[PDB]
Amino acid sequence: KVFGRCELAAAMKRHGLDNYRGYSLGNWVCAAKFESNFNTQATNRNTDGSTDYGILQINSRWWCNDGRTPGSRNLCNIPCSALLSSDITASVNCAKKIVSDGNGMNAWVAWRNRCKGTDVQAWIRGCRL
């Protein structure tokens, strides 16, 4: 599923991400836009052989099991394929654990380099929330 901007904003809010660990909803939307372009089926392989899955490109190195990432963990206790669903519940639940890990949203590369510090409220401008 490719979400629209305000649609994902609403789904993220309904799933409790708005202001989770202090991060306003426009930071989550902005991170999704640059990680997956709002596509829940996005997958991208990393050089170390791990893969990132879903709207928030959660990495099999630590967070989900895909069966082909040696030495990794599955701290969200989920198959990485659950992260590609049209229903974002598993991605959101697993992102809450990631954002609580000690480094905040800096866990997402693209958020640190493309969202952090910018006018992220623009990502939810005009949306019915």
| Binding residues for Cl ion (CB under 5 A) | 67, 69, 104
Nearer to Na ion among residue 36 and residue 69 (C-beta): 69
Nearer to Na ion among residue 1 and residue 61 (C-beta): 61
Which among Na ion, Cl ion, none contacts residue 104 (Cβ within 5 to 8 A by kind)? Cl ion
**Packed helices 5-14 and 25-36: angle between N→C axes, nearest 10 degrees:** 120
For 50, residues 6+ apart whose C-beta sits below 8 A from its C-beta are: 59, 60, 61, 69, 72
Is residue 52 annotated as a catalytic residue, yes or no? yes
Residues 58, 108: Cα–Cα separation, whole Å: 9
Please indicate if the annotation marks 101 as binding a ligand.
yes
Residue ranges that bind Na ion, judged by CB under 5 A: 60, 65, 69, 72, 74
